[PDB]
Nucleic acid binder design. Structure first.
Ligand SMILES: [Mg+2]
Ligand SMILES: [Mg+2]
Ligand SMILES: [Mg+2]
Ligand SMILES: [Mg+2]
Ligand SMILES: [Mg+2]
Ligand SMILES: [Mg+2]
Ligand SMILES: [Mg+2]
Ligand SMILES: [Mg+2]
Ligand SMILES: [Mg+2]
Ligand SMILES: [Mg+2]
Ligand SMILES: [Mg+2]
Ligand SMILES: [Mg+2]
Ligand SMILES: [Mg+2]
Ligand SMILES: [Mg+2]
Ligand SMILES: [Mg+2]
Ligand SMILES: [Mg+2]
Ligand SMILES: [Mg+2]
Ligand SMILES: [Mg+2]
Lengths: 271, 77, 149, 104
RNA sequence: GUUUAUUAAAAACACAGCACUGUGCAAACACGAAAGUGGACGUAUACGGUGUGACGCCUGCCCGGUGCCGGAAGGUUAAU
């Protein structure tokens, strides 16, 4: 549920929260954590490669199960947690034999409902089963690309991927962008839309609400000097040139896809 | 490194001469390919990083004469 | 690539021909599977004089055990027990090693690279013809039953 | 409880395993303490129009007196069974054991 | 809030918000003769770039030019 914050100061004027009361108000499960040190957008050479990353609140990596291998063992959701690494809330599942894991929580999955992976998993949200066993037309998430690799499609806050067709060995997936990608029918796919569907309804509201997430400020190009960006210069505000990246590559329309290996798995691009 | 193991090739540096003879230094890289060769006397595959000249040579001398050079040269395979 | 042959290949010659092949077809398929020797002047005399008919002693006792890998399998009673759902809808699909584990227990201790499947999945419960290529010359017809668990 | 009239149309490749289904669908009704009144396997039948690109189907008429919890379960058993093409669970006021017009 | 340490603190840059566009993951893009790494142990509600710069009422006409995008029958054109 969203909460429009009352304007008791500028910078609380526009803040729209996402108050989820289902989330656990306590410590996470300590065996499933590991260190997530920040990098600032800097590779092994030390140079800034990706810009506008740095700062923000410290985080710890939750070891989330994307591969979802424990076949034929039912698991019950113990609580829902807030995950700083991603936009979907995660769910501490307790299997019957005693192993605890996290999964990406689906849309309606709250604490108590029993989930189960495998090949014979009952078709209801939470259950992961290979896409030759999922009926054509349903909405799955956490979809793999290669079998046994781990979920890679529809893994964000409120995204889902429809299985539009099954022709033999591959299933055609109407992905979340509109792209129709063929993934093999042996790949796992967790049923149901993924949970935190109102994540796009939040408003950060103030400038330092993005610095909390590690979003350093984005200086637009037409302010810089001509040595700094192609959009530099001007004795005023001048922009008499076609909009390019800081490295000359066109932005406003130019398709920069260079993967000719996997053009075969792509029925259509997006619109 | 860009060294064909068989023929000992190596990137040589010449010039990108243009229509007005402007000389900018370039490199001629060899046509190296990492290939699994069937050594019939060992019945295992030896991966030699070999050019495309050096696969004409292996198809001529035979792989057991070529790998009898790479020991005497002192090179691993 | 002038190459010599040691077994009949389907569309270029029999044992003991000096056939022009494309130089990657000998380098990747003919010589690494032992169907050929590169036709050097030292390997012409090694074969066309010595083993011109001495290989027919060996390449025919290679296929003498072909029927001894086939004709003794005149029982044709093979059953694989895999879990299904209901009225088909198979939980555990039968592969080629799954056939070559129940042809294994019933008859020949057979390699898994021989099982030729027109479907490859055998998902639907029922009888299915499972032909073999246990040598490249004489083929088999054993029909394997899938029975529900 | 509540009286229903369930007719479902089985894919005719699976006509051999139609009693393989009714041994479960009835057993969920009689196993939920609900009677079964008439069970009339209509047999294979020509369609008036081809559903799902095929022209015949194996129909089954089955009056049911069940509590409603094991019928929504039963519709979602037709829904995920890829054999039954069409189901139609019509509610009827009384239990009719009097035979169909299409038994004769 | 930030900025010309040392004559410019500003109406400049930023900003939340908005839009366009690229990106199906071995992502685009960046740093590297390459390996690799950042992107990200993130997966389109995500990420990169671009312009605008809370909010309210709004954003009109022109595709000839210059780019971009889609077309590919014809013309013309490289090594060979
Ligand atoms: Mg950015
Ligand atoms: Mg900006
Ligand atoms: Mg911005
Ligand atoms: Mg300036
Ligand atoms: Mg410039
Ligand atoms: Mg001006
Ligand atoms: Mg002007
Ligand atoms: Mg000079
Ligand atoms: Mg101020
Ligand atoms: Mg100053
Ligand atoms: Mg200062
Ligand atoms: Mg001052
Ligand atoms: Mg401005
Ligand atoms: Mg209006
Ligand atoms: Mg306008
Ligand atoms: Mg135009
Ligand atoms: Mg035009
Ligand atoms: Mg064009």
């Amino acid at each position: 549920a969203v909460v429009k914050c009352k304007p008791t100061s500028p910078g609380r004027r526009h803040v729209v929260k996402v108050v989820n009361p289902e989330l656990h108000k306590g410590k996470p499960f300590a065996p499933l954590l590991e260190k997530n040190s920040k990098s600032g957008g800097r590779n092994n050479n030390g140079r800034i490669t990706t810009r506008h990353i740095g700062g923000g609140h410290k985080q710890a990596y939750r070891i989330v199960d994307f591969k979802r291998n424990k076949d034929g063992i039912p698991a019950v959701v113990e609580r829902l947690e807030y995950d700083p690494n991603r936009s979907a809330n995660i769910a501490l599942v307790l299997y019957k034999d005693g192993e605890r894991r996290y999964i990406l929580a689906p849309k309606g999955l709250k604490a108590g409902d029993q989930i189960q992976s495998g090949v014979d998993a009952a078709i209801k949200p939470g259950n992961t089963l290979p896409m030759r066993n999922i009926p054509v037309g349903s909405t799955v998430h956490n979809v793999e690309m290669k079998p046994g690799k781990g979920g890679q499609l529809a893994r964000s806050a409120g995204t889902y991927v429809q299985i539009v067709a099954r022709d033999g060995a591959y299933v055609t997936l109407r992905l979340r962008s509109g792209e129709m990608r063929k993934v093999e029918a042996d790949c796992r796919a967790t049923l149901g839309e993924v949970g935190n569907a109102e994540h796009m309804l939040r408003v950060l509201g103030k400038a330092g609400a993005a610095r909390w997430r590690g979003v350093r400020p984005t200086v637009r190009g037409t302010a810089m000097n001509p040595v700094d960006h192609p959009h530099g210069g001007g004795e005023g505000r001048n922009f008499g040139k076609h909009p390019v990246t800081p490295w000359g590559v066109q932005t406003k329309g130019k398709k920069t896809r260079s993967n000719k290996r996997t053009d075969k798995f792509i029925v259509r691009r997006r619109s | 490194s860009r060294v064909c193991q068989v023929t000992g090739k190596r990137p040589v540096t010449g010039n990108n001469r243009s229509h007005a003879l402007n000389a900018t230094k370039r490199r001629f890289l060899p046509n190296l390919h990492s290939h699994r060769f069937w050594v019939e006397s060992e019945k295992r595959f030896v991966t030699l990083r070999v050019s495309a000249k050096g696969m004409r040579v292996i198809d001529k001398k035979g792989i057991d004469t070529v790998l009898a050079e790479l020991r005497a040269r002192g090179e691993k395979y | 690539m002038q190459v010599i042959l040691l077994d009949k290949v389907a569309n270029l010659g029999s044992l003991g021909d000096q056939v022009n092949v494309k130089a990657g077809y000998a380098r990747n398929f003919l010589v690494p599977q032992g169907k050929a020797v590169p036709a050097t002047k030292k390997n012409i005399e090694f074969f066309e004089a010595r083993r011109a008919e001495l290989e027919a002693k060996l390449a025919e006792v290679l296929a003498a055990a072909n029927a001894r890998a086939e004709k003794i399998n005149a029982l044709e009673t093979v059953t694989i027990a895999s879990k299904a759902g209901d009225e088909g809808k198979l939980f555990g699909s039968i592969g080629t090693r799954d056939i070559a584990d129940a042809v294994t227990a019933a008859g020949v201790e057979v390699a898994k690279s021989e099982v030729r499947l027109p479907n490859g999945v055998l998902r639907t419960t029922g009888e299915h013809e499972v032909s073999f290529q246990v040598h490249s010359e004489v083929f088999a017809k054993v029909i394997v039953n899938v029975v529900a668990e | 409880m509540r009286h229903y009239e369930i007719v479902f149309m089985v894919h005719p490749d699976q006509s051999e395993q139609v009693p393989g289904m009714i041994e479960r669908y009835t057993a969920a009704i009689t196993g939920a303490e609900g009677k079964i009144h008439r069970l009339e396997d209509w047999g294979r039948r020509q369609l008036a129009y081809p559903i799902n690109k095929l022209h015949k189907a194996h129909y089954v008429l089955m009056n049911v007196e069940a509590p409603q919890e094991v019928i929504d379960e039963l519709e979602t058993t037709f829904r995920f069974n890829d054999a039954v093409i069409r189901s139609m669970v019509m509610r009827t006021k009384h239990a009719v054991t009097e035979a169909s017009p299409m038994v004769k």
